[PDB]
Amino acid sequence: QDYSGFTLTPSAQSPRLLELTFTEQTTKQFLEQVAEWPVQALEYKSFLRFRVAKILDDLCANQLQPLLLKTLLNRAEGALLINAVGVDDVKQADEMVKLATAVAHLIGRSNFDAMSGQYYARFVVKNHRVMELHNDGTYVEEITDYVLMMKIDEQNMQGGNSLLLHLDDWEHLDNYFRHPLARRPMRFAAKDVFHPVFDVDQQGRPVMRYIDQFVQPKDFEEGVWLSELSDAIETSKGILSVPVPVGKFLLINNLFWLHGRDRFTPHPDLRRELMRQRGYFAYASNHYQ
Amino acid sequence: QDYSGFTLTPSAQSPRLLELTFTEQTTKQFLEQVAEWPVQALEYKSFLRFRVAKILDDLCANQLQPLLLKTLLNRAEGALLINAVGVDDVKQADEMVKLATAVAHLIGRSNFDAMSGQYYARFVVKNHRVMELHNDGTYVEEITDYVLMMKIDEQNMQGGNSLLLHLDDWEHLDNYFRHPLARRPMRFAAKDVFHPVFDVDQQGRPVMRYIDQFVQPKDFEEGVWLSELSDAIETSKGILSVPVPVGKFLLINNLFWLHGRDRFTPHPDLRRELMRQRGYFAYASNHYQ
Amino acid sequence: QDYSGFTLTPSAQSPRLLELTFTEQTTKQFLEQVAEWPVQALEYKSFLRFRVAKILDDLCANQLQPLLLKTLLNRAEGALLINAVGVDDVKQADEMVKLATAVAHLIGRSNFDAMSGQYYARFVVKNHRVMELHNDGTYVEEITDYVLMMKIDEQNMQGGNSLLLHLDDWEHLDNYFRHPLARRPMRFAAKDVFHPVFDVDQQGRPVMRYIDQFVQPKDFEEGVWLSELSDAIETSKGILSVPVPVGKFLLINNLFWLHGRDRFTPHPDLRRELMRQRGYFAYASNHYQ
Amino acid sequence: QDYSGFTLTPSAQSPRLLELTFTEQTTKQFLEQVAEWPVQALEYKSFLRFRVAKILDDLCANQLQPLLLKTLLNRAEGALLINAVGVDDVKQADEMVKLATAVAHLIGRSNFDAMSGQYYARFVVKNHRVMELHNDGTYVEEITDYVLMMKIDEQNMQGGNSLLLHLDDWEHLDNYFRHPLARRPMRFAAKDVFHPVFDVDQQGRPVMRYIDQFVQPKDFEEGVWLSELSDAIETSKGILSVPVPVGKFLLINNLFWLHGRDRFTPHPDLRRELMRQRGYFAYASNHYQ
Ligand SMILES: [Fe+2]
Ligand SMILES: [Fe+2]
Ligand SMILES: [Fe+2]
Ligand SMILES: [Fe+2]
Structure with missing residues (x-):
């Protein structure tokens, strides 16, 4: 269909990964309307995270929040690459954080990030190897429903694509899922938690x-x-290799997508800045009370 | 009426805020009688906080403690601006702390202040924006019954009045109180605690x-x-704007008063020192055992 | 009576405070027999504390341990000033610690001292006011049965006697003991503990x-x-003022003795070193199983 | 018998201590096959500890794991001195860690070492006294089943043999085991744990x-x-004195072997590097479910 304030098209890597692009009128209006709350205001008062979320969704005629939830919860999909025209340079990192915050808080709430002390974290890499596919939040009791990873800066970067694996593209899923150890609760440690590596959604x-x-x-x-x-995951033919240009972010269902990162070329001038958020889903639905 | 050792007159900002002024004979006698315990003695031995409280109340023919309790517990009032003639200069900060301690420990006990490590805390501001109205103690289980904020020093300070809102002057109280989310326990974090933003006193x-x-x-x-x-509170027409001159302190019921602070003018020579205490009520009453 | 290895005579300050002096043959033999375990060995292996205790008691024909227990548990007494001839100079501090350790571990076990990280602690005072009478261990759940305070060094020290108050010499005991607040559990904080200021022994x-x-x-x-x-304790006519010369230590029942320290004269060359141990009683007795 | 990939011969000190030596073909093949995982990979991903274990056992035609378990669990034995030809120099410390890791994770799992923050710890001694026989893991609730101690480096070292005591070589075992205090739970502290010094295996x-x-x-x-x-253990005639040359490691059942270390000669150029692992047994057996 045609949406208000943004476009949605499938990616070249997979029909499960949809590209969502906010138009220029949507983007400049959002940034204007949220100008009075700097990022540090979103850090200090968490309800502002939801206020900028509503502002963004209102600018999309309230078509954004249901679309985000539909996509992230759809087993067939569950993954978005999101960007806003005109927001594509590291000097706009605050606008990037605002936009990602608004998107994340339409579908849920981003959890405290121990490495930053905030509801989001920014990393810079400087000075090489593949980061293996995995889920986030495996060493705490609460389920991490979504992972948000945003490219803030990228300079002199060859390689380094985000790696993605949807469980239903994993040719070995049934072999490992049907093994008794798939249901064995195992210890995870960064207090320790115990849970199996595999579980089931509501449909089994x-x-x-x-x-x-x-x-x-x-x-x-x-x-x-x-x-x-580990070997069966890392060698899976189903892995997607997705460039994430500056200003774009992946937003994926952390339960049936694994994510990782390809090896990149070391270079003296290499700089790549990332922003991450992780959180749980929370949304209205018709169910029993 | 006429009281022993002090005068009580309504403020120019609101009949709910009463100004209590200790006379010169009361003030110099109190300071004399508590001279043998420096502030550090009140820090180290908490029962001295109650001893200087009794000394002050005794100098007021025992009319002070019942008056303080009556005012702070009266729904119609609940707020005092307190001072002592002759105690109005930053060089008398210790006398200020002694006086505030004596007043606070006639109505209850001041809680440990994590930012100072003592039962009171002093701040200096140097080197701009409005501090939004709020209650203290929202992120711990114990109820904070009273807030005490004392002006220790004020130099080159334009603006910066204490902002106060009595819930019964808040024109939007019923709209938000009657909303289902008013009774929803929400998470508060500085261990986390859960409580609704609204509750009721003993009368509902x-x-x-x-x-x-x-x-x-x-x-x-x-x-x-x-x-x-937040918006409905910050834009309320009921907000009081109260100058707090050096040597005066507000003492307010933290359950139906919100407090905050207005924006002030930045100035190179600006110095404002505050002293705060927060605690619970504790007092004798005729009730069942 | 006449004891093996030591003498026992009442002090000049009170018949409740007994002076125990180990003879020269007892002292040099003990030090010889415990020479192979330095103080750091007693720190690292707690059973050596009991081994040197037995060695000392064996050198007293096993008359020491029953005498120590009888005295410390006797309501009429409960206090010892202990020394060993020839051990009276700060250069013998290790011998002092060994001797005090042997004595303490005949009647019980000394508890971990948070300020030293060991089962004993040494303080030096250099660079004035009375330390009020009190019991040790009031802010933890476990009862501290005994207090051991040893004078390791004393130079250019005028005043500073140990102050002692036996509850049965306290002329106001009945007035405060019979007050309802005497039985009121109160909060003690250095996790918080709650216990009344007064309790009863097994006889009431x-x-x-x-x-x-x-x-x-x-x-x-x-x-x-x-x-x-506090006032009724500090002004009690029953307070003992006991000089504790270098090499001597008080060992008192912490339940019915309060202890403190008198004011001393500040002096540039003043140096006073103390060693303390606190612990519980543990001893064999005929009782039901 | 004759084993695949290694030889097993009794030590000169005791028939209970067996010397296991991996052949050159076994050793160079193992190191080749585990070359792609450096020690830091074993630190970060614990399942690799089991992967290199399997690789080593596979190179021994799966005769190693059952032999290791049989020996360590055999009451009559319970102790191995293990080495691999060609791995005998401190420059091969990483190969040493890999080999010890593979051996340890065939019989169980090595526990976190608080002093290193890893599943193994390396110490260097430089700049004298006997380390008394003892068991590891006495101050935590979980049982430590095995102790692994590897000689990484040894220079200018006279003495310092590992001391071992098998409980069935301890001539005083029955005297202390039959004492009531042998069954008395005692406090152990590095939260405190309580357990008796003695217990029984499944056979009593x-x-x-x-x-x-x-x-x-x-x-x-x-x-x-x-x-x-303590005295009865330290003077036992049953103590073994075992040189542990560079590249060799002791692997002992921590329940019926005590271990310690002899005094060594201080020497300016003395350097001895050790690597330790401690863990629990975990192995397949036919038993009820
Ligand atoms: Fe991740
Ligand atoms: Fe406040
Ligand atoms: Fe004390
Ligand atoms: Fe050990």
């Missing part, structure tokens, strides 16, 4: 909560299996 | 436990409402 | 757990009473 | 959880007994 379809660094196999049986699982 | 009248920085709306529904609540 | 006789710095009266009623209690 | 045979530094006797009775126990 597999979801995952996996990362190689924080899973703690208790014995030879668990360790060998996890090392085979 | 609204009281509040609100601050925009520490309330953590869990979703879009809560966030938008809190952002409207 | 008053014992105390009081210090002015850490008791936290919750309201005007408790604060005024504690401030009167 | 004594096992121990003892160290002199962390056991905290509560009274004279416990302290004197522990000090006699």
Whole structure:
């Protein structure tokens, strides 16, 4: 269909990854209407995160929030690459944070990031290897429903695409899901938590909560299996390789998408800045009370 | 009426805010009788806080403690601006702390202040924006019954009045109090605590436990409402603007008064020193055992 | 009677305070027999504290341990001033610690001292006011049964005697013990603990757990009473003033003795070093199992 | 018998201590096959510890894991001295860690080492006294089943042999095991834990959880007994004195072996580097579900 304030087109890498682009009129109006709250105001007063969310959704005739929720919750999709025309330079990092915040807080709430002390975190990489596919939030009890990763800056960067794996594109899903250890609660440590690497959604379809660094196999049986699982994920033919240009961000359902990052070329002048948010879904629906 | 040791007159800003002034004979006698305990003695031995309280009340023929309790607990009032003639210069900061301590510990006990490590805290501001109305103690389980804010120093200060809002002067009270989210326990974080923004006193009248920085709306529904609540409070026509000259302190019922601070003019030589205490009420009354 | 290895004579200040002096043959033999364990060995391996205790008691034909327990547990007494001939100079501080350790671990076990990180602590004072009478261990749940305070060094020291008050020499005991607030559990804070300032021993006789710095009266009623209690203790005619020369230590029952320290004369060359241990009683007795 | 990939011969010190030596073909093949995972990879992803374990066991035709478990669990034995030909120089410390990791994770899992922050720890000693026999893990609730101690470097080292005591070579075992205090839970502190110094295996045979530094006797009775126990262990005629050359490691059952270290000669150029791992057993067996 045709949407108010933005366009939605499938990506070249996969029909499951949809590209959402806010128009120029939508973008400059949003930035104008949220100009009176700097990013530090969003940091200090969390309800402003929801206020700028509403402002953005209002500028899209309230078509954005239902579209975001539909896409992220659709098992067939669950992934967005989002950008706003005119917001594509590192000098607009604050506008980038505002826009991502507004998008994230239409579908839920972003959790505290221990590495930044805020509801979002920015990293710069300077001075090489593939970051293996994984889910976020595997070492805490609360489920992380979504991962938001935004490219703030990118200079002298060859490679480094975001890697994505939708569980239903993973050719080995059934082999590992049907193994008894898939249901075995395992220890995860950054207090420790225990949960299986696999679970099911409400329909019985597999979801995952996996990362190689924080899973703690208790014995030879668990360790060998996890090392085979790791291999079966990293060599999967279903992995997507997605460039994320400055100003764009991926927003993915953390339960049936795994994400990672490809190796990049070391270069003295290399600078890549990322912004991340992770949170849970929260939305109105017709259900029992 | 006429009181022993002090005078009580309504303020120019509101009949709910009463000005209590200790006479010169009362003030110099109190300071004499408490001279043997410096402020550091009140810090180290908390029962001395109550001893100087009794000394002050005794010098007022025991009319002070019942008057303080009557005023602070009276829904129609609940707020005092207190001073002592001759105590009006920053060089008398210790006398100021002693006097405020004696007053506070006639009606209750001042709680530990994490920012100072003592039962009171002093701030100096040097080197601009309005501090929004709020209640203290919203992020701990124990109720903060009273807020004490004392002007220790003020130099080259244009503006910066204390802002006050009595809930019964808030023209939007019923609109927000009657909303279902008014009774929804929300998360507050500086361990997290959960409580609604609104509650009731013993008679069913609204009281509040609100601050925009520490309330953590869990979703879009809560966030938008809190952002409207914030606006409805900050633009209320009922807000009082009270100058607090050096040596005076506000003492207010933290349950149905919100407090804040107006914007002030930045000035190189600007110095404003404040002293704060927060605590709970504790007092004798005829009730069942 | 006549004891093996030591003498026992009443002090000049009170028949309740007994002076125990280890003879020269007892002292040099003990130091010889414990020479192979330096103080740091007693710090690292707590069972050595009991080994040197046994060694000392064995050198007294096993008359020391029963005498120590009898004296410390006797309501009429409960206090010892202990020394060993030839151990009276700060250069013998390690011998002092060994001797005090052996004595303490015949009657119980010394608790971890947070200020030193060991089962004992040494302080030096250099660069004035009376330290009010009190019990130790009032802000933890476990009862501190005994206090051991040893004079390691004393130079250019006028005054500074240890102050002692046996509850049965306190002329106001009955007045405060019979007050309802004597049985009121009050908050003590250095996690907080709650216990009354007064309690009873197994026979119903008053014992105390009081210090002015850490008791936290919750309201005007408790604060005024504690401030009167404090005054009634500090002005008691029953207070003993005991010089503690280098090499001597007081060992007192912390339940019915309060201890403190008199004011001393400031002097540029003043140096006083103390060693303290606090612990619980533990001893064999004929009782039911 | 004859094993695939390694040889097994009894030590000169005791038939209970078996020497396991990986052949050159086994060693160079293992190092080749695990070359793609550096030690830091084993630190960050614990399942790789089990992957290199399997790789090593596969190179021994799967005869290694059952042999390791049989030996460590055999009451008559329970101790291995393990090495790999060609791995005997401090410059091969990473190969040493890889090999020890593979061995340890065939029989169980190595626990987090608080002193290193990793599943193993390396110490260097430079700049004298005997380290008394003891068990590891006495101050936590979880049982430490095995201790792994590897000699990484040794220069200008006279003495310093590892000391070992198998409980069934301890001529005083029955005397202390039959004492009532052997079954008395005692306090151990580095939260505190309580457990007896002695326990039994599944057959009722004594096992121990003892160290002199962390056991905290509560009274004279416990302290004197522990000090006699300590003496009876340290003077036992059953103690083995085992040189551990660079590249070799002891792997012992921590329940019925105590370990320690002999005094060594201080020397300006002395350098000895050790690597330790401690963990629990975990292995497949036929038992009820
Ligand atoms: Fe991630
Ligand atoms: Fe405030
Ligand atoms: Fe004391
Ligand atoms: Fe050890």
